Design a binder for this molecule. Structure first.
Ligand code: HEM
Ligand code: HEM
Ligand SMILES: Cc1cc(N)nc(C[C@@H]2CNC[C@@H]2NCCNCCc2cccc(F)c2)c1
Ligand SMILES: Cc1cc(N)nc(C[C@@H]2CNC[C@@H]2NCCNCCc2cccc(F)c2)c1
Ligand SMILES: C[C@H](O)[C@H](O)[C@H]1CNc2nc(N)[nH]c(=O)c2N1
Ligand SMILES: C[C@H](O)[C@H](O)[C@H]1CNc2nc(N)[nH]c(=O)c2N1
Ligand SMILES: [Zn+2]
Lengths: 407, 411
C-alpha cells in the first residue's frame, strides 16, 4: 500500500503515497504487464464532481469550509436539474494545470504551474475556434520565446454536439502518396491530408506544407481554415560544422501543440483542448527525422558524412543520429526559438519528481516515454524507478473524429 | 482470450495466447504499473502440481503427452515426492528445463539462441573445490579461444534451504572495486562490497583498475571458500579505436565472457540456487553501461576531453558524441581480436525475428521493454516501436537475495 521507488545511480529511495488516490485503470494485471502498449450519466457524474471539488478546496486550504460545502451543494443541484454543470474559472484553471501535473508521460512537468489558460467556453462556431487558435499560436510562440498554454472549448453535452480539432497538432506537415510508391512529406499525416483535400483543400504538394485546421463546432460538420503563415514560426536546419547540411532543405516548426486529446475535469469532458509548450530536441531530431515511418533521413545523412554503411557494427546510424540532433538544437538556438535538450529536460524532471514526492507524496511517471529515444542510460531518468498510475484531472487519447462522426 | 501487440513502425499486429499459461505475479495491479521497478522451503502440498505442470510441458514438447512413459514418470515423481519430499530430474528434463528458463527470460534480447545451450550437469558436486573445477571447465568451454559458446553449469538444488549451493560472485568474471579514503573508487564501483568480503575472506588484493576477482564458493550450505580462476582462462580485450590512436592510452580493457552466477533456476518447482550461465556480450553493455554509467567507470568526461568536444553546454551533445565513439571502440576491439560480440542493431533485429517466430510456433514471447531496448539509440532500433507483453512462465531465472545477507556463518 506504501511503495518505494529507488534510484539505482544515486541509491536514493522515495516513498509514494499518492497512488492510493488513483482512480482509473492501467491496462496491467497481476498476470500481465502492458507498460509498453501505447493504447491499453447523471449518477456517475456527481461523485466525479465531488472528488474534484474536494481536492480543489483542499488545495486552497479551505477544506470543509462553508464555501466548500456551498459549492458542493450548488453543483449537486445543477447536476440534478441540468444533467451537467459548469466549472468556475478558478476551478477550470486549477483543473487544467493539474491535468498537466498528472500527465505521467510528460517529462516537462516541472513547468506545470506556469500554464496560461484560455477560456474558450463561450465559443459557438468553427470560426470562433479559428480566432481562438490563432491567438493561442501567437501568444504561445511569442516571437520564439515560447510560453506554455491551453485553449479550452465548450464541454461535451450529449455527445452529438462535440467540439473537436481534427488535426492531431495545431501545426503539422502534409503527407501525400505518390505514383512512385514513395511518400512525399510526413507519412504520419497521409490519411488526414486526404481528408483535407476531399474536404476542399488546395494542397500545394510539397514536402513541408503546413496543414490547414479542420475545425468542428457543436457537433457540426468540420470546416477548413489556413493558419496565417506569418503565425507559423519555422526553423531551417543547419549544422555548426557541416556546411552541406542546409542542402537537405530540412525545416521544423517551433510550436508543438497537441490538439487531439480530451481533458477530463471533475467528470466533465472537454474534447477540443489544444495545448502547447516547447520542443525537446530528440522529438524532432530522433523521432520526426529518423523513424522509418517518418521523414527517415538516416541513410541520406550518413551518406553525406561518408561513413561505412556496409555493416551495422560501425555505428553509422548512431553517428549520424547524434549529428542530426546537434543540428536541430543548434538551428533552434541560432534563431532564438526555445528548445530544450534531453540531458537538461530529464535533469529537470528528476528534480521535479523529488519535489512531488516531498510535497504531494508522489509523481506518476511512464518510464517508457520519459526516457529519451536516444542515449537513454546517460540521462538520469533511465536509472529512476517510476510508478505509473492514472490520476484525474487528466488528458486522455480519444478516437480520431472521422471514424465516429457522421455527415 | 486474445491479446494483440502492435508494431508502430511496420503495422504488423500479433496475438498472444501463451500468456494464458503464466503462473507467477508481475508486481503490476489494475491500479499501478510497476513495469520499471527492478525488483517488483516448499511443501509436498505445493510441489507436485508444479512438478506435474512441468512434466506435462516436457512430455507435450516431445510429442509424448499421455503416453505410458508420461504416466509412469508422473507416478514415479509423485512417489519420490511422497517418501523423500523432493524429486530428481532426468538429464533430459534438466536440459529442457534450462533451455526453457532461457526461452522464458523476458528481459533477454539474446533469445534467438535459446535452443543452442550447452548444459553442464553438476548435480554430483559436493564441495567448493568441486564447484571451482566445474566453473573452470565452464569458463574454458564457453570461451573457446574467443569463438564463444553459450553454456550453463547446474549445481545441486535446494533441499531444506540450509544446504544451499551458491556462487557468491554476481558474474564469474568481474573486476574488483576499491573505495579509497578520499572517497574516490579504483576499479569497478559496482563491486566494492563483494571486493571487501573477498579481502575479508583472505584475498590479497593487487589494488589495480582491472583486477579479476576470485570466486567465492559455498557448497552444501557451508561457509564459502576463495579460489583464483587461472589467468590463462580469463580472455580479456584491450580497448582501442579505429581512428583515434589516443584511445588505447586510456588503458581500458574488458573480459570476453559475460557469465551471470547469482540467479536462481526454477524447474518443476525445484530450486537451483547456483546455476551460473553465459553467452556473449552485446557491445552496449560494456560501452554504454560498464564504461559510461556515473556509478561505474564513468569515462565520458575523460573521453570527450581527449576529443576536445564543447563541454560547456550539454546542448552540444558532447556526451552523446563520446558515447558513440566509446561503443565504436568496443565493437572494433572485440572484432579485431576475434572475440564474439554483437552490436545492438544486429541484436534487436534478431530479437524481433525471434519474437515473431515465437508468436507463430508458441503463441507468444514474454518480453520486458524497459530491458529489451538498448541504453543508447533506442528508437533507431526496431524493438523501440514494438509493443510487448511481459509475464512469467516457468522454468525461469529469478533474482535472489545476496548470500552475505542470508548466510548463517558456521565459523
Ligand atoms: C513546456 C515544455 C514541455 C515539454 C519539454 C514537454 C515534453 C513532452 C515530451 C517529450 C512528451 C513525450 C511525447 C512524445 O514524445 O510524443 C510529452 C508528452 C505529453 N505532454 Fe508534455 N511537454 C511540455 C509541455 C506540455 C504541456 C503544456 C502539456 C499540457 C498542457 C503537456 C502534456 C503532455 C501530455 C498529456 C503528454 C502525453 C501526450 C501523448 O500521450 O501523446 N506537455 N511532453
Ligand atoms: C547468447 C548471447 C546472449 C546475449 C547477447 C544476451 C543478451 C542479454 C542482455 C543485453 C541482457 C540485459 C543486459 C543487462 O542489462 O544485464 C540479458 C539479460 C538476461 N539474459 Fe541474456 N543474453 C545472451 C545469453 C543468455 C543466456 C545463455 C542466458 C541463460 C541461459 C540468458 C539469460 C538472461 C537472463 C536471465 C537475463 C536477465 C538478467 C537479470 O535479471 O539481471 N542470456 N541478456
Ligand atoms: C496513437 C497515439 C497515442 C498517443 N497518446 N499519442 C500519439 C502521438 C505520437 C506519440 N509520440 C509521438 C507522436 N506525437 C507527437 C509528439 N507529441 C508532442 C508531445 C509534446 C511535446 C512538447 C510539448 C507539448 F506540449 C507536447 C499517438
Ligand atoms: C538489482 C539487480 C537485479 C537484476 N535482476 N539484475 C541485476 C544485475 C544488473 C542488471 N544489469 C546490469 C547488472 N548486471 C549486468 C550483467 N548482466 C548481463 C546479462 C547477459 C548478457 C549477455 C549474456 C548473458 F548470459 C547475460 C541487478
Ligand atoms: C511500443 C512503444 O510503447 C512505443 O514505441 C513508444 C515507446 N516510447 C515512446 N515514448 C515517447 N515519448 N513517444 C513515443 O511515441 C513512444 N513510443
Ligand atoms: C530503473 C530501471 O528500471 C533500471 O534502470 C533498468 C532499466 N532498463 C535496464 N535495461 C537493461 N538492459 N539493464 C538494466 O540494468 C536496466 N535497468
Ligand atoms: Zn505494468
Amino acid at each position: 500500500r506504501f511503495l518505494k521507488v529507488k534510484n539505482w545511480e544515486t541509491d536514493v529511495v522515495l516513498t509514494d503515497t499518492l497512488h492510493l488516490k488513483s482512480t482509473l485503470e492501467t491496462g496491467c494485471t497481476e498476470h500481465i504487464c502492458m507498460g509498453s502498449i501505447v493504447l491499453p450519466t447523471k449518477d456517475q457524474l456527481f461523485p466525479l464532481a465531488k472528488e474534484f471539488l474536494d481536492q480543489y478546496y483542499s488545495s486552497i486550504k479551505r477544506f470543509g469550509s462553508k464555501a466548500h460545502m456551498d459549492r458542493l451543494e450548488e453543483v449537486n443541484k445543477e447536476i440534478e436539474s441540468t444533467s451537467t454543470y459548469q466549472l468556475k474559472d478558478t476551478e477550470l484553471i486549477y483543473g487544467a494545470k493539474h491535468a498537466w501535473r498528472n500527465a505521467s508521460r510528460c517529462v516537462g512537468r516541472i513547468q506545470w504551474s506556469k500554464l496560461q489558460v484560455f477560456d474558450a467556453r463561450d465559443c459557438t462556431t468553427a470560426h470562433g475556434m479559428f480566432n481562438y487558435i490563432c491567438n493561442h499560436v501567437k501568444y504561445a510562440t511569442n516571437k520564439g520565446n515560447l510560453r506554455s498554454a491551453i485553449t479550452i472549448f465548450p464541454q461535451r453535452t450529449d455527445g452529438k454536439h462535440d467540439f473537436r480539432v481534427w488535426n492531431s497538432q495545431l501545426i503539422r506537415y502534409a503527407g501525400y502518396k505518390q505514383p512512385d510508391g514513395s511518400t512525399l512529406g510526413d507519412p504520419a499525416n497521409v490519411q488526414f491530408t486526404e481528408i483535407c483535400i476531399q474536404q476542399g483543400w488546395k494542397a500545394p504538394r510539397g514536402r513541408f506544407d503546413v496543414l490547414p485546421l479542420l475545425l468542428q463546432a457543436n457537433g457540426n460538420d468540420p470546416e477548413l481554415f489556413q493558419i496565417p503563415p506569418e503565425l507559423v514560426l519555422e526553423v531551417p536546419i543547419r549544422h555548426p560544422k557541416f556546411d552541406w547540411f542546409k542542402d537537405l532543405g530540412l525545416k521544423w516548426y517551433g510550436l508543438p501543440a497537441v490538439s487531439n486529446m480530451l481533458l477530463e475535469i471533475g467528470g466533465l469532458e472537454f474534447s477540443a483542448c489544444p495545448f502547447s509548450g516547447w520542443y525537446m530536441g530528440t522529438e524532432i531530431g530522433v523521432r520526426n527525422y529518423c523513424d522509418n515511418s517518418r521523414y527517415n533521413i538516416l541513410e541520406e545523412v550518413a551518406k553525406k558524412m561518408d561513413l561505412d554503411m556496409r555493416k551495422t557494427s560501425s555505428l553509422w546510424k548512431d553517428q549520424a543520429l547524434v549529428e542530426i540532433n546537434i543540428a536541430v538544437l543548434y538551428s533552434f538556438q541560432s534563431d532564438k526559438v526555445t528548445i530544450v535538450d534531453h540531458h537538461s529536460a530529464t535533469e529537470s524532471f528528476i528534480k521535479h519528481m523529488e519535489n512531488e514526492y516531498r510535497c504531494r507524496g508522489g509523481c506518476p511517471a511512464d518510464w517508457v516515454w520519459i526516457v529519451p529515444p536516444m542515449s537513454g542510460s546517460i540521462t538520469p531518468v533511465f536509472h529512476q524507478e517510476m510508478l505509473n498510475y492514472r490520476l484525474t484531472p487528466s488528458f486522455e487519447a480519444q478516437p480520431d473524429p472521422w471514424n465516429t462522426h457522421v455527415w
